[PDB]
Amino acid sequence: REIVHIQAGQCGNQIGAKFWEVISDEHGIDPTGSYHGDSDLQLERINVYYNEAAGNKYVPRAILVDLEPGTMDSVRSGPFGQIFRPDNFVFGQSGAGNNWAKGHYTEGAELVDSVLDVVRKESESCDCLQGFQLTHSLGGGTGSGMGTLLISKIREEYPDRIMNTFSVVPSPKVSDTVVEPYNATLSVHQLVENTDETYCIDNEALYDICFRTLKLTTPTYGDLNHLVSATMSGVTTCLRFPGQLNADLRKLAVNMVPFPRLHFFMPGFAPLTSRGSQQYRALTVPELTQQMFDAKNMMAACDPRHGRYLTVAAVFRGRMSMKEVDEQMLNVQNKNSSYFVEWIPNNVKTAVCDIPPRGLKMSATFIGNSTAIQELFKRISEQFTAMFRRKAFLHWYTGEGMDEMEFTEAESNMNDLVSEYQQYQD
Amino acid sequence: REIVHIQAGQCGNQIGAKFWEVISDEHGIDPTGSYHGDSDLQLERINVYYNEAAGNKYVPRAILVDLEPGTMDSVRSGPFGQIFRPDNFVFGQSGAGNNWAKGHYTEGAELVDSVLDVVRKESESCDCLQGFQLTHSLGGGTGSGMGTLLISKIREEYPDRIMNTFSVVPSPKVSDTVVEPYNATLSVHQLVENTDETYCIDNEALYDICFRTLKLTTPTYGDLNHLVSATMSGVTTCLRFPGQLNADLRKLAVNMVPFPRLHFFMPGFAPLTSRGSQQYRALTVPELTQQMFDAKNMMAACDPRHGRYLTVAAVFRGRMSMKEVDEQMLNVQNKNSSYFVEWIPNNVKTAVCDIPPRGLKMSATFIGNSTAIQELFKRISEQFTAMFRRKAFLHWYTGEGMDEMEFTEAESNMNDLVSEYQQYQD
Amino acid sequence: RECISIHVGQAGVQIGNACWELYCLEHGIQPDGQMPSFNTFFSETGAGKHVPRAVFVDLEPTVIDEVRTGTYRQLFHPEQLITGKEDAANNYARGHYTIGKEIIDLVLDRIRKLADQCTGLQGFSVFHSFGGGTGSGFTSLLMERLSVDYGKKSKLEFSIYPAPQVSTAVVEPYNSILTTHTTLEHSDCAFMVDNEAIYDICRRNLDIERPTYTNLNRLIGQIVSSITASLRFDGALNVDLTEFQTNLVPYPRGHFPLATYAPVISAEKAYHEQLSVAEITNACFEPANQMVKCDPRHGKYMACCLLYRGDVVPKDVNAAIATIKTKRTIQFVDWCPTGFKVGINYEPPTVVPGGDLAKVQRAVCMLSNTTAIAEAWARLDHKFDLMYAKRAFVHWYVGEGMEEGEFSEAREDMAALEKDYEEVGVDS
Amino acid sequence: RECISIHVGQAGVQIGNACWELYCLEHGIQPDGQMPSFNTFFSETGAGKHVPRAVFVDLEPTVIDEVRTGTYRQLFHPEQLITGKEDAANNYARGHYTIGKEIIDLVLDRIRKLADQCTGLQGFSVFHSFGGGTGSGFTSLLMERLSVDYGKKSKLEFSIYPAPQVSTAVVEPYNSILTTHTTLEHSDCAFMVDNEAIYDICRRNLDIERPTYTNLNRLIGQIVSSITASLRFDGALNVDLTEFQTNLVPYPRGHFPLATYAPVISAEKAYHEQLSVAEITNACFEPANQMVKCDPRHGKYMACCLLYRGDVVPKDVNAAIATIKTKRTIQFVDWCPTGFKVGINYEPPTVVPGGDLAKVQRAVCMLSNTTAIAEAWARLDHKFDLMYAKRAFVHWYVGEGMEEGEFSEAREDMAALEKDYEEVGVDS
Lengths: 426, 426, 428, 428
Ligand SMILES: Nc1nc2c(ncn2[C@@H]2O[C@H](COP(=O)(O)CP(=O)(O)OP(=O)(O)O)[C@@H](O)[C@H]2O)c(=O)[nH]1
Ligand SMILES: Nc1nc2c(ncn2[C@@H]2O[C@H](COP(=O)(O)CP(=O)(O)OP(=O)(O)O)[C@@H](O)[C@H]2O)c(=O)[nH]1
Ligand SMILES: Nc1nc2c(ncn2[C@@H]2O[C@H](COP(=O)(O)OP(=O)(O)OP(=O)(O)O)[C@@H](O)[C@H]2O)c(=O)[nH]1
Ligand SMILES: Nc1nc2c(ncn2[C@@H]2O[C@H](COP(=O)(O)OP(=O)(O)OP(=O)(O)O)[C@@H](O)[C@H]2O)c(=O)[nH]1
Ligand SMILES: [Mg+2]
Ligand SMILES: [Mg+2]
Ligand SMILES: [Mg+2]
Ligand SMILES: [Mg+2]
Known about the structure:
4 chains, A: CATH 3.30.1330.20, Helix Hairpins, C: alpha/beta, structural protein
């Protein structure tokens, strides 16, 4: 039942920082690693994410990896740096320069072999691995490059374990580097063959959530990465705590993947609104389902209603009735049937567990698999072709040794994924 | 059984402000939304106008809409701004300039789509809608323009729900803008096809009530809009509280509309007199019926006795006998038979409920449908033609894109309405 | 719902001097910019200093230097104080082109800066004379460029009308006529004011022996704030600048409402007097209180708008209107039935320390579109004719590049304008 | 992640003087070396004295002696102060070979010493002029040797562009062109700056009557630290020098980004002004704030990078970018879709005691690869042609051993460069 988490790149490092913060909050673990919880259940499945160290202290089953010391140090300096063991800090000293070729192909590979040995050590300490979780960017050098190398090696060693990853998706409004589409394309190409699932979160959408719904004037990554961590913890709540339905991630994978190559997901979250209105809220399941269905509360920058749904997973936290949840989610499909694909009767599946998130009575996490997602791939592929056709900046990757066909084939596979969404779309 | 109310424009915003104030008074709801009532009946049908928020707090089922932030803010700053949720404040930032073309045709449409989504949200939260209530001006840009757009979209979505609206009618003594008749004509044209009923209240008459009967030297909108709210609450008293006759608005619609296109009403109210004389009053049903019949206590600027009645609805609040009310209202018809149209034996219909207005032992609301109303349409149509013939100011609407025939046809339909009143008149 | 104030020439700047002083008085703004409290006219810096959203332009340093040496120089941002090095010699040719064309780009970019500072610009107001150089000619140039980039934003212009008495340039008719045309082409609403009528009010209602521009500007400035500040502050019946466009201009050309204002009474005569809403509005329909030298009883009305400050009730206004309709001699044109618009704020009228007018509890601004304006135009046409008949001084423009036909043309355009007012006045 | 600063000639050294002064100001370094606190630029001795990782070379003692007599002479290690005995007479022939060749080996070994002192050298930055001798010629020699032993380390060069106004050598075009070629051959990124554009900024935005090099250097120095110190100190979005290579150079030849910087405002004008992230970046896209004499509106963009200091939020930057895309006139070349890179530190901008610029809460450095750079090259080509047409002064190089064809060659190489910029600008 255990999961090994790996943080790659600043994105990975900071999102994961928030993730581990939250998970320790879930179990009553203080920043020193000491358990001071509230419930027995907090310990009962603590093993998924922690090792019990002498003295009832816990160590997160996760590896922090990068090519820049400063980042790693900044994470270690904060709360929760203390909970991590020195053994999990693997890093170099010179970033990749946002170059997948440097991260994946050359330099990052040098660290990856040591990372893998630590991975192996941890998998050996585990009783039974459930899977692996990676947090990284789709556009960065170690996040997409190094991280994808690591993934190919882990899946190689553990074919039946669940490989999932959470990753930051480029947007026209975000884009930092000109070769960001190049890095994305190359990573996608690999991820589509080497993962079981990946979550596509876009900072653009996250900013909109923060202002529009959360009424923040200054969205920061500290809060943006908070929202991501909410969804990341949501997906293993049932795994960690008793409940009624679908606790296992594999069960979820079975119900969420109709076709081997379409494994990209749209996370969302409810309740997600500022405090000002919270005094007028009345959470009910219909209320949570209204917010989860609404595209504005999606973390992915994509409106599902533009495409069609293949699968929907909803995970509920806190004590709700079976009827209420199952009736209401059925009703979502009933009322919005035009946005679902007719192949699957009962497209909406639910998971329900008995432990609510600290501070809320109830909560719900949304995982969608809709053909609308192809739009995100269009943004990347399009931008790519413009660069690629002229070979602008290509020399920086050819300097590493990357072949034009390596990129060409990478594009090809991206085009395949879009076409497959279209084949299922309609 | 539920009603969604929408406040459009300053008129709508301020009249509705008083309306909601009154409705919360009716049910014992304080400005925070907390219930501290007197009776069980106050809660028993609170659902028509409220949502129960966590903690026994209630939220008014209504949307506040305008193009000017300041107005919206001023409403929100007062008592009862707190009772409204942020979700119901929909507004832009630039008024329409009193231009129906800007409100209906262009700019207001941009907000209307978001308003409608909120409307839909609320109708989804309801168990069963009874209908919709709008409060707006006939002469303003968002009140008549935006509001009429909104109405066409709502009726489209809910054909069998009751669409009623309360609106401020221009008068020669009130008239602010030169294009006010233009806005009125255009709104009328639409309202006659798209509503089930509209109440025609004229500030002129209201001022007369305030001074003549209420003995006020300085009539203010704060009090004028109070009188309107009295009548607005009167029509759903029975709906909200147990009684004996005609609680439903649809029942009233059935009894008040003899012909599909004649759906304009003359509200009035009793008791309506200053305190000085109240010590000499002795309310009886004859007393209430005397005041309600008397044209001076009508809120519409029109004397029914100049035309003829098609229908009369009287709603009584408080514990009165059946005989007293039914005998006396029969006697009104008997004594004033010359002002009723002979087509309908028993032109006067009554509704009687058991809950009196706070502060009174008994009260009565008058709804008339008399052919005299055509005079108000004459004032508008006449003024219109003078402007229209010369095209003074027309360019401001043609600037938006309005066609001379759009206005021509609008006039035509106004002329039809007057002719139909004449056909029934005699 | 913000705005920008543009002051060109000494007429525009000196009037502006009183205007911003008044704005300080309206909100308790210290000369240093510190103000504890108007965001439509000011932006705020992190220091808590507020800065007037305005641009002051003078092709001769002189007046701007005066600003720079005054107390409000700490309020104004240095970039807003723009100056040339030579005036236009009272001459449009230089104002509009030869000289002014060399500075105008600076000016426009500072305007853009402010335009970018504003979030929701409603528009802007410009102050200048008709007869000057910078004030007329430069102004023309300015409006040509502003209508390109802003377009649709409100273009309010306040123009000083040359009086027969005061006349400071012999070619004022020429300057004025050239200008007029361009204002017809690009303004949304022009308000022309005659210093000679104002003087008459000051000597009779304010009882002032010897009026100066400083006193004259105070009066005008207050009127302007009664139109704008009063919209910004909110009251009962708020009336936007866009509503004025919509309501005051029947045809694209008739954009010349005139202003009348009351109470304009000295402190000494105000004792003892209390004016009701109706009484003040009766003063507003008296020619003797008209800020433009013309006869309101002669012309007809097409549009009228009354704005109220302080203690006013709609009901009292309603009664006042009936009185105007019945008392008067307000011949309204058939083309507009009844056209009276009413805006009522709660903001009370303000008083300038060391002022010349009484403290008042209610105040009324009258804007009106009347056919009497043609009268003023007729006077200017005649004056032009005389000068142009001889062609005296024509070389001062022609030698700067102007074309004879340009002058003919502009006059003709004014003649057309006057004729259009005739036509609208013809009942139909 | 350390670096070395190399200062050659008076241009490089005097700029360096301000640069190290600024570094002292950034970290509270005393002239004696004592500092209680930058390890990328300083190494520490057991005394707690820190030593600037830099080498100062001047073929004439004069300037180095100035350094030696200044307060920071206790900061600098004597071995880092290298001097010759005669200048290059403004002449590459001597700078690069005849004279400079006799010292360069010393210099390189001192560099090696520092290279061995660093543990993880990211690279180094060099300061010099294009028109001098030592600064251009010697510099060329230097880069030839540094690329041999270091290779791959970052080669950033800051070159002063000869202005038409200031011209101190008649053979500057010749000096510059010879140099240019070699910088094309061995630098990774060259930043040329025009003192004449800088003066314009100082006289208008800093309001300085009489700019000197000491004021000019302060401005440049701050920009350079905003690029480097700001990377060393860590912030939100740290951006390495290798990322600049990767992101700013599309083809091996286009390594000439230009710099623009804002806020460049005097204290007096800064009062009252508060600039947002967006507003500062709007200043950064204005030609008037450009540190190179060219027109950014003329050319097209290929790459742009904005670095932020102090109080900046990514969201505000995102909005600013949208504004630049929509406002502008930023014609980006098809070859690069969207190329805007953003680096955001937390380190606030610093102020030099006795400075000329206001204290600011946020600051923005703009680096950009634009086709407008060709313009500058065209000017130099022309000047060369004139001199070379006559062959005036040619004997001062030829007599030192230069070959006629060498000059022809170098010009031609620049012509090719300009043509390559053309080609990239051609959309495809
Ligand atoms: N929601 C978030 N996205 C981030 C964050 N930091 C970076 N990013 C995003 O990730 C991508 C840039 O990547 P990184 O910082 O992760 C690069 P990384 O450090 O993995 O590799 P290098 O090339 O060696 O620097 C890009 O889309 C940034 O915009 C974060 O904290 N939160
Ligand atoms: N009984 C009342 N009538 C009002 C009130 N406010 C305005 N009105 C009347 O309504 C019409 C003017 O309209 P508004 O304020 O509602 C205009 P609105 O804000 O809907 O649109 P805009 O054109 O965008 O300003 C007119 O007949 C006024 O005389 C009020 O508070 N009470
Ligand atoms: N109300 C008012 N009118 C003024 C003021 N100053 C000048 N005027 C009038 O405006 C006209 C004067 O314009 P000038 O001052 O000559 O010129 P200018 O428009 O500033 O521009 P230049 O001719 O280039 O100097 C005359 O008709 C004056 O009566 C003032 O402060 N207030
Ligand atoms: N910004 C800036 N430019 C400078 C400074 N000193 C000189 N320059 C410019 O750099 C060029 C001068 O180079 P020189 O001082 O003649 O020569 P050098 O490059 O030091 O080397 P030699 O010719 O051998 O003395 C001119 O274009 C000057 O305008 C300085 O301190 N700051
Ligand atoms: Mg990194
Ligand atoms: Mg309004
Ligand atoms: Mg002047
Ligand atoms: Mg020298």
